[PDB]
């Protein structure tokens, strides 16, 4: 399906460059909890909501990349001459992010030292999300509409990216300051967002089609919600609340 070798290699390069930028951020907090043997400063509510965001994106990537049954439903849907919009680096990212989120969740349990349980309202959201996904599973099952089910997981991942960014931007607006700002972590999130979009743009200009942006709408919105909020964070840090 890849027509151009330079475009394919630049797609593969931009792919692992997006993977590295978003996967390396998981380590500084992981190591900090380890050195301390405590999770006092951690928002437990956010770690449980990011597990749902990561596992839903992981469901979609692992299934579309490895299942030929689901892939055939993608061609039946977006077109026979369509390239699958899941990359090796997207699969690697989703699995690595699920592993790292499970490790920090394990650190919260074994290291404890976090009386601030936080756990409430956000627990109801996990119940509502996984409940709505369970109903969706039983709807999809008789017809084996695994592409529609995988597609719900990718849409709930989108909602969950908003859940990552919106409370932290809202906090900065009420607070009238950017507390916890790090030009480095924002630039790593930014690179991963631009590179995840440049990957789709390369797949789209290699083939003469934009259907990959519609097939993997969840990855398209994952990059655009990251880029929008990084511009907004940089905007409220330098021109709004600087000092």
């Amino acid at each position, epitope marked *: 399906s890849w027509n151009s070798i330079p475009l394919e290699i630049s797609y593969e390069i931009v792919g692992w460059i997006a993977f590295a930028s978003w996967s390396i951020s998981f380590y500084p907090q992981l190591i900090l909890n380890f050195r301390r043997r*405590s999770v006092v400063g951690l928002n437990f509510d956010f770690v449980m909501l990011n597990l749902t965001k990561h596992s839903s994106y992981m469901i979609y990537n692992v299934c579309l990349y490895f299942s030929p049954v689901i892939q055939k439903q993608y061609f039946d849907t977006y077109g026979d001459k369509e390239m699958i919009p899941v990359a090796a680096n997207d699969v690697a990212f989703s699995i690595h992010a699920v592993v790292m989120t499970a490790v920090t969740l394990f650190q919260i349990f074994i290291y404890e030292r976090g009386p*601030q349980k936080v756990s409430r309202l956000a627990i109801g959201i996990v119940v509502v999300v996984w409940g709505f996904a369970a109903i969706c599973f039983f709807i999809a099952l008789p017809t084996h509409s695994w592409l529609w089910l995988i597609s719900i997981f990718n849409s709930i991942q989108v909602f969950m990216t908003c859940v990552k960014y919106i409370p932290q931007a809202k*906090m900065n607006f009420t607070r009238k300051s950017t507390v916890g700002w790090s030009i480095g972590n924002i630039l790593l999130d930014f690179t991963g967002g631009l590179a995840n979009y440049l990957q789709m743009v390369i797949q789209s200009i290699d083939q003469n089609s934009w259907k990959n942006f519609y097939g993997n709408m969840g990855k398209t919105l994952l990059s655009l919600i990251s880029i929008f909020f990084d511009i907004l964070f940089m905007f409220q840090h330098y021109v709004l609340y600087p000092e």
Partner: nanobody, 121 residues
């Protein structure tokens, strides 16, 4: 910006008591969840106690549960660490702590200079 000033600590003999204090500046203590931490020489910082944002709910490290007590005087903007039944184990620079809890991305920890509490057998 925000300043923390600990005082009350010094040398005491095993079995004694101390009333550590913390003078908050830049923020109300009744609005924030206040913490106490300790650091023994060479060993890493250890969270010791906490008092809820708008209430009297408290939490302590298992090493001090039953001996230490955290309270706050609203009419003084200060947090206290009434530490009874002291042991030479408890020797450390005690820091009162407040933070700017941050949903995703790094929480900002505010510290005082600390007060050395030395307990001798």
């Amino acid at each position: 910006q925000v300043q923390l000033v600990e005082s009350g600590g010094g040398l005491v003999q095993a079995g004694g008591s101390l009333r550590l204090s913390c003078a908050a500046s830049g923020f109300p203590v009744y609005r924030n969840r206040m913490h106490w931490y300790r650091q023994a020489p060479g060993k890493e910082r250890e969270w010791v106690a906490a008092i809820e944002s708008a209430g009297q709910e408290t939490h302590y490290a298992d090493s001090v549960k039953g001996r230490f007590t955290i309270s706050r005087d609203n009419a003084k903007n200060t947090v206290y660490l009434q530490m009874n039944s002291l042991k030479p184990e408890d020797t450390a620079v005690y820091y009162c702590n407040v933070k700017d809890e941050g949903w995703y991305w790094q929480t900002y920890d505010y510290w005082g200079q600390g007060t050395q509490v030395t307990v001798s057998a």
